[PDB]
Design an enzyme around this catalytic site. Structure first.
Site, PDB file in Angstrom:
ATOM      1  N   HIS A  79      43.339  40.040  31.037  1.00 18.43           N
ATOM      2  CA  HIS A  79      42.395  41.069  30.528  1.00 18.43           C
ATOM      3  C   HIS A  79      43.270  41.439  29.007  1.00 18.43           C
ATOM      4  O   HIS A  79      44.450  41.594  29.288  1.00 18.43           O
ATOM      5  CB  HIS A  79      42.223  42.167  31.192  1.00 18.43           C
ATOM      6  CG  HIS A  79      41.333  42.041  32.609  1.00 18.43           C
ATOM      7  ND1 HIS A  79      39.830  41.863  32.616  1.00 18.43           N
ATOM      8  CD2 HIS A  79      41.799  41.603  33.898  1.00 18.43           C
ATOM      9  CE1 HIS A  79      39.617  41.479  33.900  1.00 18.43           C
ATOM     10  NE2 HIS A  79      40.722  41.433  34.578  1.00 18.43           N
ATOM     11  N   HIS A 132      43.187  35.327  36.375  1.00 25.08           N
ATOM     12  CA  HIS A 132      42.472  35.606  35.119  1.00 25.08           C
ATOM     13  C   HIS A 132      43.157  36.798  34.511  1.00 25.08           C
ATOM     14  O   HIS A 132      44.383  37.276  34.953  1.00 25.08           O
ATOM     15  CB  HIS A 132      41.028  35.573  35.442  1.00 25.08           C
ATOM     16  CG  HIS A 132      40.684  37.259  35.810  1.00 25.08           C
ATOM     17  ND1 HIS A 132      40.400  36.954  37.450  1.00 25.08           N
ATOM     18  CD2 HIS A 132      40.693  38.277  35.634  1.00 25.08           C
ATOM     19  CE1 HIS A 132      40.444  38.250  37.691  1.00 25.08           C
ATOM     20  NE2 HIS A 132      40.523  39.034  36.699  1.00 25.08           N
ATOM     21  N   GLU A 192      44.058  46.813  31.852  1.00 29.01           N
ATOM     22  CA  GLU A 192      42.915  47.598  32.621  1.00 29.01           C
ATOM     23  C   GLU A 192      43.529  48.832  33.136  1.00 29.01           C
ATOM     24  O   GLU A 192      43.169  49.788  33.036  1.00 29.01           O
ATOM     25  CB  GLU A 192      42.560  46.777  33.875  1.00 29.01           C
ATOM     26  CG  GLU A 192      41.498  45.541  33.150  1.00 29.01           C
ATOM     27  CD  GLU A 192      40.427  45.234  33.963  1.00 29.01           C
ATOM     28  OE1 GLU A 192      39.119  45.289  33.399  1.00 29.01           O
ATOM     29  OE2 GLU A 192      40.498  45.072  35.233  1.00 29.01           O
ATOM     30  N   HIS A 201      45.675  39.154  36.713  1.00 30.06           N
ATOM     31  CA  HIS A 201      45.200  39.402  37.986  1.00 30.06           C
ATOM     32  C   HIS A 201      45.167  38.373  38.688  1.00 30.06           C
ATOM     33  O   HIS A 201      44.501  37.192  38.522  1.00 30.06           O
ATOM     34  CB  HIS A 201      43.793  40.045  37.720  1.00 30.06           C
ATOM     35  CG  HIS A 201      43.566  41.356  37.281  1.00 30.06           C
ATOM     36  ND1 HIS A 201      42.446  41.995  36.899  1.00 30.06           N
ATOM     37  CD2 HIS A 201      44.682  42.374  37.137  1.00 30.06           C
ATOM     38  CE1 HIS A 201      42.712  43.378  36.472  1.00 30.06           C
ATOM     39  NE2 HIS A 201      43.958  43.333  36.562  1.00 30.06           N
ATOM     40  N   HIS A 234      33.858  35.923  30.084  1.00 29.06           N
ATOM     41  CA  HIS A 234      34.511  37.255  30.230  1.00 29.06           C
ATOM     42  C   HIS A 234      35.990  37.275  30.179  1.00 29.06           C
ATOM     43  O   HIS A 234      36.378  38.255  30.077  1.00 29.06           O
ATOM     44  CB  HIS A 234      34.027  37.740  31.668  1.00 29.06           C
ATOM     45  CG  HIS A 234      32.456  37.860  31.688  1.00 29.06           C
ATOM     46  ND1 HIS A 234      31.713  38.754  30.837  1.00 29.06           N
ATOM     47  CD2 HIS A 234      31.654  37.260  32.475  1.00 29.06           C
ATOM     48  CE1 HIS A 234      30.599  38.379  31.261  1.00 29.06           C
ATOM     49  NE2 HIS A 234      30.389  37.617  32.195  1.00 29.06           N
ATOM     50  N   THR A 263      36.833  44.854  39.247  1.00 34.17           N
ATOM     51  CA  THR A 263      36.686  45.559  37.922  1.00 34.17           C
ATOM     52  C   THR A 263      35.566  44.799  37.098  1.00 34.17           C
ATOM     53  O   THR A 263      35.610  45.296  35.817  1.00 34.17           O
ATOM     54  CB  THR A 263      38.053  45.711  37.312  1.00 34.17           C
ATOM     55  OG1 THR A 263      38.432  44.380  36.830  1.00 34.17           O
ATOM     56  CG2 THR A 263      39.087  46.293  38.120  1.00 34.17           C
ATOM     57  N   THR A 264      34.718  44.132  37.679  1.00 30.53           N
ATOM     58  CA  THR A 264      33.467  43.409  37.127  1.00 30.53           C
ATOM     59  C   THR A 264      32.557  43.633  38.112  1.00 30.53           C
ATOM     60  O   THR A 264      32.763  43.766  39.365  1.00 30.53           O
ATOM     61  CB  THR A 264      33.599  42.026  36.745  1.00 30.53           C
ATOM     62  OG1 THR A 264      34.205  41.226  37.868  1.00 30.53           O
ATOM     63  CG2 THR A 264      34.912  41.721  35.790  1.00 30.53           C
TER      64      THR A 264
END
Ligand SMILES: [Zn+2]
Length: 256
Positions: free
Chosen positions: A89, A87, A99, A112, A61, A193-194
């Site tokens: 995005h 991590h 995001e 993040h 992910h 957000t997951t």
């Protein structure tokens, strides 16, 4: 195992993802509540020595860097945190993948840094509790030259291209992955957000971005693979309705 996009919704498997106070959100700076109680962020212990090394993993992910004990972050009185992991995005060739958005504008990518309130001792205790987790979020933008701090991580993505693979990287200055302006940010209460989309997370979004070269942004978006044999790309959740929440700003926006 959940995936980014589709079809199928997220709440079918993880009902809390349909909560009322989810992240990410669209930030509209002219409408944020100016809050002079929001003082400059305070970090300590983020300048790591070369040893020991840190775990860097492709989890299918994102790419996630595990942070060692001893990184402290303070949002204000009564709001102290320990850093756990960071991590990213991102999008794809010619498509941005942050995001959070600002006035509907999506930035190339987003970092993040996830933290645990000092009030708890384990992440599982903090999930869902107001203020139990705090995330520092910064946008990544294209600049003209190579970002030397990010290159320490981006140069290691090829060896973790396959989903589930891992490597070790030397310690580095984690604060050099973040903007230099610690005084200007937005703050609101939202969620992971997951899945499982647990609420109560304090989100702090820097106003200033960090700059990576075009080549570095391509390395981030084009190197990793996800589940099955799909490329790990466009790994961002859509923005979520504020539902009456007020976003605070630590600074006056605010003219155009
Ligand atoms: Zn994230």
């Amino acid at each position: 195992h959940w995936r980014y996009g589709g079809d199928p919704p997220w709440p079918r498997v993880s009902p809390a993802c349909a909560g009322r106070f989810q992240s990410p959100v669209d930030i509209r700076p002219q409408l944020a509540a100016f809050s002079p109680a929001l003082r400059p962020l305070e970090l300590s212990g983020f300048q790591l020595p070369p040893l020991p090394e840190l775990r860097l993993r492709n989890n299918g992910h994102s790419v996630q860097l595990t942070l060692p004990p001893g990184l402290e972050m303070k949002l204000g009185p009564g709001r102290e945190y320990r850093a756990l992991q960071l991590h990213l995005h991102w999008g794809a060739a010619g498509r941005p993948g942050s995001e959070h958005t600002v006035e509907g504008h999506r930035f190339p990518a987003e970092i993040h840094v996830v933290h645990l309130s000092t009030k708890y001792a384990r992440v599982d205790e903090a999930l869902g509790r107001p203020g139990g987790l705090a995330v520092l979020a910064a946008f990544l933008e294209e600049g003209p030259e190579e970002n030397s701090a990010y290159e320490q991580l981006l140069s290691r993505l090829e060896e973790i291209a396959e989903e589930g693979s891992e490597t070790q990287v030397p310690g580095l200055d984690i604060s050099a992955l973040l903007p230099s302006d610690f005084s200007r940010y937005f703050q609101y209460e939202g969620s992971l957000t997951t899945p499982p989309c647990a609420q109560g997370v304090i989100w702090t979004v820097f106003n200033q971005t960090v700059s990576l070269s075009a080549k570095q942004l391509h390395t981030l978006s084009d190197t990793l693979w996800g589940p099955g044999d799909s490329r790990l790309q466009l790994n961002f959740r859509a923005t979520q309705p504020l539902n009456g929440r007020v976003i605070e700003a630590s600074f006056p926006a605010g003219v155009d």
